[PDB]
């Protein structure tokens, strides 16, 4: 019987083994047909691409079935909105998550290619600044691994975080053209572009509020598959790209409309009020929500008709998690769509809105919070400002009702901030429109409830939660440290990879001679490997037997790279003072990027190199001390240096680091930690036991006691001879002969306006470091303590974090069951 | 025995049938894995892409073997440099050339998809303005079909010729974002980017001339396969894309450097002296020649070492054909590279240069010739200007030597033109640095030798050749008119497809009743099909029995769309005058684009629509006359309307149309021609016999006689009552009631400053048209005359043209032998 076109298309089947032989054929097919190459001209980069496309097929197949599965079941969809997604490399992570690594390694070997070499070819997908963006990345990995119907929505920056170059000891930013050789993992959807409006004005009419005479910029989505660990679950990361909606000049000008998604703002924990950044936030928000609603409506499998027009179930089928306030406009935008476009009444739309959105705070520092001036919002998004004002009036009335007669409270909790410039407090907006607000570490969430968000916590205590951060154990252990992962597996099996708390079992081997020996060996191995990669991809020197003292993270005054520098110089002087005394050999590495406009951070980077130039060439010091500034710190570099570290520097001022995640990676990889009772350090110390940590410095309480009286760095200066010695060297030009005054700003800040009180923790920091070097003299005890750390790092897996987000906020249950293949 | 990496990589084999079943699998694989789609969301566009990628594989496989074959044999490589490549659609052309059409049609049918529908989805690769760009396209097709190791080098404009919209009867240009949904046929080579220098200055040193302090813009090549007809020969079309070599603003500014390859200048037969256009010409030239030399050097198969460092054989291994003067900078650039970079002495470099380059002229019109002012070249390319000056001195000395004492001759032949503005005559540059200069049609090449290039012809007669244009019979017959191709094949077989002269055999059927009937039927069929496509994709009306009077080509005063308009109105008035007289029903279609800045051409487009608004709604006229302006004329539209035409309008002023190619397409497809003895019309008339053509108007000689005395349109006006009637309607506002003066410029030009003498050919044009309508009254005789045209169109195949270029200029012999598969 003649089949109709419908019956025939049923052959359009997802079909077509993870065989070494089959991998070979495909690699061969992609190299020629996809790359339009052959062995006569194929470069290592070409072979890397051939492999990427080969693995990609297996990724794509799973992806399609996963996405088809979500339409079949209609599960509550989780949308993680973020302006950053610090993904890193994808090849190895994909192979390990799909269990293709061994088969692929063999296939390439049989073709005369080295898979490790091909992997090094790949560039980082550095669409992030630091912790916040990397957290989003770990989160996607964990959500897929926990079988959640999760999505990541953000911007596809043509230029991510700048590639940092060092010349003359100074940071030199260079455009990160990460898309130069193309991105094989993404898939453009030029067919699903959506309109985003800007400017214009609002006309209030008898058939609704009309936002007219707007400027339109289109949003084109690019899809990237995100694989869960061996469960065949592949979710989606959706990033938006801006597109245009005297003839020649007009055509050349089209390109200008696309500058919205051109580059990532290089600010970390710092609010820069640029309209372009505001356009980026709205851009991602408007496109994302249109897409979310569109997917919600077309729920029937096999059918693309908008069958689900009723929003009653919207909050039970959708969850929008705001990564910081950057995507906070999602609140008034969702309201705009529902009220203005769907004709829903305000109250009912507000209920849906609040039940859909949840807000995550990542800092308590004033300069990092978003406070957009109203004149800007008014010109760029008049309708949203009108909506923001209404939300505030409704919200303020509730505040008035709960605290009658509290005049100053109305001022404090208002979404509208008066002052030199009238602004809208985005954190206040997020709290008002979210059914949940969470800190990112226990001490941080508590601080929020007691300080900046105290008034809000009193009005709606139920909203406030804590969701201690975490990192994914696939990338931050299995990928970056296979040697350690292997040594661990030999003892407890491979279950820990997807259930990190399993690591506690290692406690039973804290006295095992072989284990102790094998753990130390992996570290040594990693130390050598890094020393190698270091002196082969750059200029470097090593005595891989020296203690690797590492502090990698974005350069910030609050993170205190300067406190570390004071120690370095102090040690230098101490070695010179008593040349006939034994000093534990140490290699102090400091790496991280500074925002271009952050003058002080740049000066700090320059201090590190200036110090190195002196120390690294002092014969009296020999190789008892080496100071290095690790150039261009990024995800792929983190993956190499962290497994090679002995000491993890997590020294931010108590109360400033909301959580930190590098501290977690360090612990998971065999390094001991020296740090303050700040952010997640507190819980790490608690898990491992304080005797197995090098805790030092002021606690949050002490910092406050000092703040109420007034901090006076001079008081410590006048009583610590060693410190004065260090400061005078900086001030007199010892570390800058050519430019005696080079470090004047740094000294003047430390002495007269140090918001992070470096001098207050100096003495205790130096003493703590001595304690560190002492334990290092006892290799057996140093490693047993390491074991005690690794075995208690389970709580810091991002799966645990996500599990709580899913259960305590999203209302979805984690799953470990796998889809077929 | 353990195979080394070298022996292992031998498996990196080109491998992996044109089976309906195999096509199905692949289509299925691409739809899912390549497109990341499935039947649940797949759109017709998605299916078109699935098919494109499927065919592409078979294209790519052949391509690799073809390119590998050229390195194995080291044949003389032919480089066709052009600023335009009017390619059109690729899907059908690829399938027919690879004999995959039937198998693909069946495969799609079995999946419930219509292949014709999928093909309509594809967009034109309109990187051209008109004839010149389309010629380059036909040429690539013919070179591959004649097994020449040929290449096409140009710019990959992000925006080709604007998509023309008509609103209010006016042309409205819209950006041609042809890359919106991606281009599956191209392959980016981000790894082979080359540096292009601009500005800076020259330092003359003891180790050569150094061009320093330049601005650099990179050139990234995109490769597109070009298939020959059933010979498994797939050549390459290489187009260049520009790439970049207050932090945020700096990053946003990177994009500005890429504006060089942003848009195609919409000028046809018109020189606009913009620096950007000059940058485009140098851009394509510098990148192309670096690539040419690089390929020349690495000649050994399997080896990429530059083994061939000696240039002695360069002219026997390379040929650069300049399509017009646009790429003329190739002459001084090649000299720069050889002399400045390769350290070759001038004379020896000049010999190589002249033996490598050949120049093709496409117009004698003064405003179309490139004359770049020296201040511009001096600022943008100082070194090239220095080289241009040297070439001129050397050249002028030779002129002095050949014509001693000829003072004015030195002035005329100089590459440097004095005047209001000092410029460099690029045509003069091309002639001086080329071993061959060719016209593009017999009458044109003769005109060159007698007028603008007369002095040069006297100095070096040997250089001047003629290469009468042609069109490819695959696309312009097999693709666009399968019905006619089929009717023809039934009689003489399929050999004509690659040997057009085979069509002469059709003469034996000029009296065959069935043939006569079948030829007329195909036309009728095409007429209906076009009427359909017309009223379904736009608004249209038809009486497919009316004579289809068509004039499609770029709007120009020299092409005389206005003469056609005068006839249209004359006929309108005639029908109204004698309502009780029989008038052969006619549908006059006029289509074509006007450069944005060409005011007169735009007014002409507006006249066509203005006339239509009146004629098409006059009840007294009924459907005895319909005037239509065919919107957005382009390659894919040409492919639809030309097969449906009865009368081909080729009415340019004698001596102005260098050749024309549309005239050829029309003849090949069954339309009779009404035109002047101009360009290729002359040879067409000669081939078919003048009795089978509707020749009219002034011949070249007459135009000159009138020029020497002075043209006075008033003289014809005062003696032709019917003409005055038409002009007064235009002048008084009959065709523009709302705006009586709308056509004032057109009238004033026709009456007082008509460089193309429309009035001089009016009377004879009208009479000739009457003769046309008369023959149309006799369907049998009209078709027998058609047959006499089609059967003598063989000479106009581009294979014949290319064959002569290959043998008379390039020194390579055409081949019809096929490579294996
Ligand atoms: N209505 C549907 N029924 C079944 N699968 C669907 C449907 N809509 C989309 N999909 C699948 O889900 C993937 C992601 O689509 P989207 O959710 O629109 O981003 C598509 O590439 C299809 O494979
Ligand atoms: N040295 C060579 N020996 C054999 N084939 C080559 C060589 N160089 C290039 N090819 C082939 O020719 C194609 C075009 O290369 P190219 O000529 O550099 O544009 C490459 O994709 C290879 O398939
Ligand atoms: O929440 C993820 C991260 O966000 C920010 O980067 C905070 O500064 C950091 O402490 C936190 O770990
Ligand atoms: O040579 C190709 C074409 O070049 C130009 O477009 C000429 O105007 C045209 O007459 C010629 O056919
Ligand atoms: N990222 C940043 N941090 C601190 N101050 C800044 N001033 C400008 N950019 C800054
Ligand atoms: N293309 C063109 N032809 C004639 N005149 C023009 N003036 C500006 N552009 C022109």
From Swiss-Prot, chains A, B:
PTM annotation (N6-(pyridoxal phosphate)lysine): residues: 665
Site description May be involved in allosteric control, residues in chain: 151
Name of the top EC class for this enzyme: transferase
Site feature location: Involved in the association of subunits: 104, 138
Positions bearing Phosphotyrosine: 199, 222, 457
Sites of Phosphoserine modification: 13, 414, 498, 731-732
PROSITE patterns linked to this entry: PHOSPHORYLASE
Cofactor(s), by name: pyridoxal 5'-phosphate
PTM: Phosphorylation of Ser-13 converts phosphorylase B (unphosphorylated) to phosphorylase A.
Catalysed reactions listed for this entry: [(1->4)-alpha-D-glucosyl](n) + phosphate = [(1->4)-alpha-D-glucosyl](n-1) + alpha-D-glucose 1-phosphate
Residues binding AMP, per UniProt: 38, 71, 294-303
TM ranges: none
Activation/inhibition comment: Allosterically regulated through the non-covalent binding of metabolites, being activated by AMP and inhibited by ATP, ADP, and glucose-6-phosphate. The activity is also controlled by post-translational modifications including phosphorylation.
Annotated GO biological process: glycogen catabolic process; glycogen metabolic process
Record-listed E.C. numbers: 2.4.1.1
GO MF annotation terms: glycogen phosphorylase activity; nucleotide binding; pyridoxal phosphate binding
Keyword terms of this UniProt record: Acetylation, Allosteric enzyme, Carbohydrate metabolism, Disease variant, Glycogen metabolism, Glycogen storage disease, Glycosyltransferase, Nucleotide-binding, Phosphoprotein, Pyridoxal phosphate, Transferase
Gene Ontology CC terms: cytoplasm; cytosol; extracellular exosome
Pfam families reported in the protein's UniProt record: Phosphorylase
Pathology noted in the entry: Glycogen storage disease 5: A metabolic disorder resulting in myopathy characterized by exercise intolerance, cramps, muscle weakness and recurrent myoglobinuria.
NCBIfam families: P_ylase (TIGR02093)
Subunit structure: Homodimer. Homotetramer; to form the enzymatically active phosphorylase A.
Family label: Belongs to the glycogen phosphorylase family.
Role summary: Allosteric enzyme that catalyzes the rate-limiting step in glycogen catabolism, the phosphorolytic cleavage of glycogen to produce glucose-1-phosphate, and plays a central role in maintaining cellular and organismal glucose homeostasis.
Name of the protein this chain belongs to: Glycogen phosphorylase, muscle form
Species the sequence originates in: Homo sapiens
Recorded name of the encoding gene: PYGM
């Amino acid at each position: 019987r003649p089949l109709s076109d419908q019956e025939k298309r049923k052959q359009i089947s997802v079909r077509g083994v993870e065989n070494v032989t089959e991998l070979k054929k495909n690699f061969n097919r992609h190299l020629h047909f996809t790359l339009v190459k052959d062995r006569n001209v194929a470069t290592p980069r070409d072979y890397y691409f051939a492999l990427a496309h080969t693995v990609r097929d297996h990724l794509v197949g799973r992806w399609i079935r996963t996405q088809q599965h979500y339409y079949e079941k209609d599960p509550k969809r989780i949308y993680y909105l973020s302006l950053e997604f610090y993904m890193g490399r994808t090849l190895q992570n994909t192979m390990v998550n799909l269990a293709l690594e061994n088969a692929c390694d063999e296939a390439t070997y049989q073709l005369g290619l080295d898979m490790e070499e091909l992997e090094e070819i790949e560039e980082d997908a550095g669409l992030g600044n630091g912790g916040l963006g990397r957290l989003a990345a770990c989160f996607l990995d964990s959500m897929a691994t926990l079988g959640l119907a999760a999505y990541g929505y953000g911007i596809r920056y043509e230029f991510g975080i700048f590639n940092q170059k060092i010349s003359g000891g100074w940071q030199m930013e260079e455009a990160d053209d990460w898309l130069r050789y193309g991105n094989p993992w993404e898939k453009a959807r030029p067919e699903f572009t959506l309109p985003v409006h800007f400017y214009g004005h609002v006309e209030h009419t008898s058939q609704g509020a009309k936002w007219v005479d707007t400027q339109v910029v289109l949003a084109m989505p690019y899809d990237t598959p995100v694989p869960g660990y061996r469960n065949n679950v592949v979710n989606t990361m959706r990033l938006w790209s801006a597109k245009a909606p005297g003839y020649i000049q007009a055509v050349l000008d089209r390109n200008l409309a696309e500058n919205i998604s051109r580059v990532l703002y290089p600010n970390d924990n710092f609010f820069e009020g640029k309209e372009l950044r505001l356009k980026q936030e709205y851009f991602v928000v408007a496109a994302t929500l249109q897409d979310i609603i569109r997917r919600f409506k077309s729920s029937k499998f096999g059918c693309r008709d908008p069958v689900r027009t009723n929003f009653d179930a919207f909050p039970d089928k959708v969850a929008i998690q705001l990564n910081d306030t950057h995507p906070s406009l999602a609140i008034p935008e969702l309201m705009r769509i529902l009220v203005d476009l769907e004709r829903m009444d305000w109250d009912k739309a507000w209920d849906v809105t609040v039940r859909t959105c949840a807000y995550t705070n990542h800092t308590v520092l004033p300069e990092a919070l978003e406070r957009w001036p109203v004149h800007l919002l008014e010109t760029l998004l008049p309708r949203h400002l009108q909506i923001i004002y209404e939300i505030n009036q409704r919200f303020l009335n509730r505040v008035a009702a709960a605290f009658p007669g509290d005049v100053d409270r109305l001022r404090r909790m208002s979404l509208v901030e008066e002052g030199a410039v009238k602004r809208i407090n985005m954190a206040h907006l997020c709290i008002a429109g979210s059914h949940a607000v969470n800190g990112v570490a226990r001490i941080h969430s508590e601080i929020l409830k007691k300080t900046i968000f105290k008034d809000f916590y009193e009005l709606e205590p139920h909203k406030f939660q804590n969701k201690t951060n975490g990192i994914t154990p696939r990338r931050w252990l299995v990928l970056c440290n296979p040697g350690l992962a292997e040594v661990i597996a030999e003892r407890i099996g491979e279950d820990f990879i997807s259930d990190l708390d399993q690591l506690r079992k290692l406690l039973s081997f804290v006295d095992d001679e072989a284990f102790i020996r094998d753990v130390a060996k992996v570290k040594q191995e990693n130390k050598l490997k890094f020393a190698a990669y270091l002196e082969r991809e750059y200029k470097v020197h090593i005595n891989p037997n020296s203690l690797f003292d590492i502090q990698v993270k974005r350069i910030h005054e609050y993170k205190r790279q300067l406190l570390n520098c004071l120690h370095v110089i102090t040690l230098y002087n101490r070695i010179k003072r008593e040349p006939n005394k034994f000093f534990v050999p140490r290699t102090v590495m400091i790496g991280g990027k500074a925002a271009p406009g952050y003058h002080m951070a740049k000066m700090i980077i320059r201090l590190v190199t200036a110090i190195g130039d002196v120390v690294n060439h002092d014969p009296a010091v020999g190789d008892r001390l080496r100071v290095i500034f690790l150039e261009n710190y990024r995800v792929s570099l983190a993956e190499k240096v962290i497994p090679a570290a002995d000491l993890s520097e997590q020294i931010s001022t108590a109360g400033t680091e909301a959580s930190g995640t590098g501290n977690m990676k360090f612990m998971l990889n065999g390094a001991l930690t020296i740090g303050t009772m700040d952010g997640a350090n507190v819980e790490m110390a608690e898990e491992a036991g304080e005797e197995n940590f090098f805790i030092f410095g002021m606690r949050v309480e002490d910092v406050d006691k000092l703040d109420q009286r007034g901090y006076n760095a001079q008081e410590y200066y006048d009583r610590i001879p060693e410190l004065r010695q260090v400061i005078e060297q900086l001030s007199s030009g010892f570390f800058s002969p050519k430019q005696p005054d080079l470090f004047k700003d740094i000294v003047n800040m430390l002495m007269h306006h140090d918001r992070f009180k470096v001098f207050a923790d100096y003495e205790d920091y130096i003493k703590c470091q001595e304690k560190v070097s002492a334990l290092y003299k006892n290799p057996r005890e140093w490693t047993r303590m390491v074991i005690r750390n690794i075995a208690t790092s389970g709580k810091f897996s991002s799966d645990r974090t996500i599990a709580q987000y899913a259960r305590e906020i999203w209302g979805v249950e984690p799953s470990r069951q796998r889809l077929p293949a």
